[PDB]
Amino acid sequence: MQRTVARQVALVECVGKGRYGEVWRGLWHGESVAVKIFSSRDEQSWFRETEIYNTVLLRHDNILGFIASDMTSTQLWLITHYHEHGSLYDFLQRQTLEPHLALRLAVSAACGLAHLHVEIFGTQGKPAIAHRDFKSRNVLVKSNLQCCIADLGLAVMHSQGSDYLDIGNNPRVGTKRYMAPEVLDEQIRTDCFESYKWTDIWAFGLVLWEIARRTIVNGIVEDYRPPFYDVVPNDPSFEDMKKVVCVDQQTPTIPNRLAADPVLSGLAQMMRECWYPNPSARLTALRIKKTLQKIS
Ligand SMILES: c1ccc2c(-c3cnn4cc(-c5ccc(N6CCNCC6)cc5)cnc34)ccnc2c1
C-alpha cells in the first residue's frame, strides 16, 4: 500500500513550480524523496502516470523510480526518488560539460528512451511505450551523472499482439518548443504507434543539441540556451513553432565547429538524423543508443 508512504512523508523544500503543479523535496525515514503535487488543470497526467507506474514493470536505472501515488481541498500526489542536481535543464544551466560527461548524459538518456520504446515480451516484460513530452526538463541527472527519464503523464502504449493504441484522455499536448513538424502540421497519424516514437526521437535530437552547446571544446563553450532560442519567444505559441519548423523548415544550428573533433563529430551527424522531415527516415532510439556506446 502507497497510502501511508504519503502519510509519513514530511515536505521540506519546494524545488519547482509551474503549470503542471509543484515538486517538493521530502523526507521519508531519513532518505530524500520527490513529491510532485499536481495542479487541478493537470489531474489527467497524474492518473495516467499512476496507471502506468502501477501497471507496467518499468523499473530501470534510466527511468525515474516510483515510490507511491496518493489522493491526500483536493490534492493528487506522486512520490518518487529525489535527484539533487534536478533536471538536465537545471544541470546544463549551471554546469559546463567535458566531452566525456556530455557522452555519459547522452548515452544514459538514450538508454532510458530505448527501454521505453522497446517491447519486452514475457511475464517480466512490458509493452512498447512512447513518451510524447520528451524534453530536458523531463530528464533528471543522478548523483553518478547519469540521466533518467521522468513524466509519463502523456505516454502511449502498444503491444505487437493487440493492435489498438492505448491512449489516455488527457487534453494536454506535447511541449510546443519540442513538437515535431508532423505534430505542428497536424499531419501525424494518431492511430499509429510508430508515429509517436518518431516524435520522441525528434525531441531527443533537440536535447542532444542542448548538451552539445554546453560541451567544452578548444576551451570554447556557449552559455545555455533552449532549442530555437534565436527564432521564437519564451512560451512559443503553436503558431510561432508552426512557422519556424514547418514553413521556414528550420532546425537548431549545428555548431559550425561541430566536425572539428572525433567523439563530437558524430553527435552532429546524429543530431541531423533525428531531424529529418520525413519521420520514418529518423534513427530509432536503439540505433542511437548503439552508435553512442559504439563511439564509447
Ligand atoms: C518531471 C521532472 C521531475 C519530476 C520529479 C522530480 C524528481 N526529482 N526532482 C528534482 C527536481 C529538482 C531538484 C532540485 C533542483 N535544484 C537543486 C540543484 N540546483 C538546481 C535547483 C531542481 C529540480 C525537480 N523535479 C524532480 C518528480 C515528479 N515528476 C517529475 C517530472
Residue numbers in the entry: 0, 195 to 265, 270 to 493
From the paper:
Activin receptor-like kinase 1 (ALK1, encoded by the gene ACVRL1) is a type I BMP/TGF-β receptor that mediates signalling in endothelial cells via phosphorylation of SMAD1/5/8. ALK1 synergises with Notch in stalk cells to induce expression of the Notch targets HEY1 and HEY2 and thereby represses tip cell formation and angiogenic sprouting. ALK1 signals via phosphorylation of the transcription factors SMAD1/5/8, which act synergistically with NICD to induce the expression of Notch target genes, including HEY1 and HEY2. Here, we determined the crystal structure of the ALK1 intracellular kinase domain and explored the effects of a small molecule kinase inhibitor K02288 on angiogenesis.
